[PDB]
From Swiss-Prot, chain C:
Glycans are attached at Q46. This is Erythropoietin receptor. Erythroid cells and erythroid progenitor cells. The gene is EPOR. The record marks F87 as: Required for ligand binding. The chain holds residues 32 to 241 of 508 of the full protein. Residues 117-203 form the Fibronectin type-III domain. Changing F87Y: 8-fold reduction in EPO binding.
Amino acid sequence: SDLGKKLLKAARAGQKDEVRILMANGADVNATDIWDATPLHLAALIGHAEIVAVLLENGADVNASDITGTTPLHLAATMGHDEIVLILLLKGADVNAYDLNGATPLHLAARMGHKRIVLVLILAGADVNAQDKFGKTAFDISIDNGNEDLAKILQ
Amino acid sequence: SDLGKKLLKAARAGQKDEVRILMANGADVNATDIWDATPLHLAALIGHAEIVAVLLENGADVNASDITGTTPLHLAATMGHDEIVLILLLKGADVNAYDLNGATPLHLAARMGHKRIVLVLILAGADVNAQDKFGKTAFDISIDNGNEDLAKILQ
Amino acid sequence: ADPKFESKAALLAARGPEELLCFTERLEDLVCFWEEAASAGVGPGQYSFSYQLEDEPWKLCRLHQAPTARGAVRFWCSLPTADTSSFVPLELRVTAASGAPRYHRVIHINEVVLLDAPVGLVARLADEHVVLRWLPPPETPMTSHIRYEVDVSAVQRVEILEGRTECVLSNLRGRTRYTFAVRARMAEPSFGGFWSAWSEPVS
Amino acid sequence: ADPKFESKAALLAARGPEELLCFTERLEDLVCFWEEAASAGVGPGQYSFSYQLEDEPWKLCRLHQAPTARGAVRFWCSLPTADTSSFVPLELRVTAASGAPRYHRVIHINEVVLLDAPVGLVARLADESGHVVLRWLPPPETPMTSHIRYEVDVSASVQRVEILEGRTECVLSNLRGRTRYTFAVRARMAEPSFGGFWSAWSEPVSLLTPS
Ligand code: NA
């Protein structure tokens, strides 16, 4: 709807107050764009933690996937948003959800060298052995980028 | 022994190479000082993550306690060492271990306002309700220091 | 204008490898790029760059394949001027021809400014010490809001308040020739970005 | 040095409350202190300060109870010069008489230096109209001036400019005109091995611009 589209725009812009207004007006917390990305997808990508908490409090799907299969945990893992990874994990996100490339948030975090996100995902219950469409594990990605500190953890 | 004291001294100074050398020379990875603090206690207090990983793989007690009852997870929590808290947790540290003051690492982290560590401890399985000798919970410490962001999580 | 973009692209590539990197030079343009290994069947027609700004429908941008000195393959897209509005969020998407994800980001045009290198750096010794003078980067607006930084090699790095285009180095180890270089950045209130490249060094 | 230590102790207490704070002045001394609420049965004999440096056995330092202006009780211990060696790690521990922990830290004498306030701050109207030239002297009885970083504060609100180490003068770019500005400078140790906290502000001076 008109309100549903404005909720996505407000979450992308990082407008905390506007999100609260649109929610009270009855906007769909899972309103999707052309790519099937919810407002939680954009708040996770932007790295706004207050809005992520608000959307989750109003019934947002923590495991929502878009056309590409990207869940909001993938976006928080890649961009390096440590708090939003933890918040989504406590809300009940699937650590082992994969996208169209078969990459779990452990893969995306390992590619970007986010050591703490990698450790948080393992603590949450990530599958270290799991491989993507190319057949590479999170350990195999660290070896290719020369991150010896990361590789020792994924053993 | 001769090597055991030099291992503690090397871990305090943050000398990664010397630790590996002394380990190969047969030093006790759990060599204790006058206060019963192991080299893993000192590497956690210094915030050296490379040395902590070395000691743990070489058979160091992750749940070692000193005279004060302080475990290395307590030290990493107070000093605000996000990486070492995660490493010790994956190595098998007791999230609900208390010192002589009855304070769990969730208490110490909340007192210093380390929001990110608090979420890590909750995910690992910390007891939010747990009280110290004074009878205060992790939530009760946040309200006294005016950290409203910290208090809302422990609600 | 493309040999400098070549140097600018290699500049950011060192800081954020495995990322999608965007930058603007005159606040009316935008150049986004990323670097990856060469694959047998993959070219610029195997990826799809799409952006969405304000409430205008998702638009497609043309990708260009170009090789780098380090052996990787650089794919870059230059957003048109009409779509570069400085102070609104801009959603970016790079999707593989199979439908699989590659990059997804939200940026602000004003927050990603990479200036040119300063020019005409002149070092003259007055007794105290050396006084350094230079010109602002060419074709760059709002000179009064440009912060600088000077590098000395023997190392020392001195910050220069925005607007000022000269400095005096107080204490030095001796009359030997030091190597100087200056780089520029965008200051405040809303603007920000990356350090530009170093100027032509002088001794 | 004891009326100054009081001001220095109150200075650091505002930045890092609820922890043990140490500082050195001439790199040959070390004074550690902390502040807590007054308890009926607690004095300096209910806590135990112990330090260990290099390979020397754990030594005991004498604590002194003193009240503060804010009502809290300050406990401080001054390590002897013979035990203050500048470039090695120093383990510190404060243990309660019951055996319970209080503080545990590892510090370096060189990394925790709190200098004196700069002196002789002079504000002069620059020949180029609109600018103000500030000149000052390094803190008194302080060696190695070339490794001292400064910072200047301008008051109408505030404006704060960083000053490269060694330099004892600056030129201020922007002025409002007929308003009176208040200037002050403070100093800390910069590089390479030395470090610490910002000193107190210098004696402020005021200047009036002519539009
Ligand atoms: Na913090």
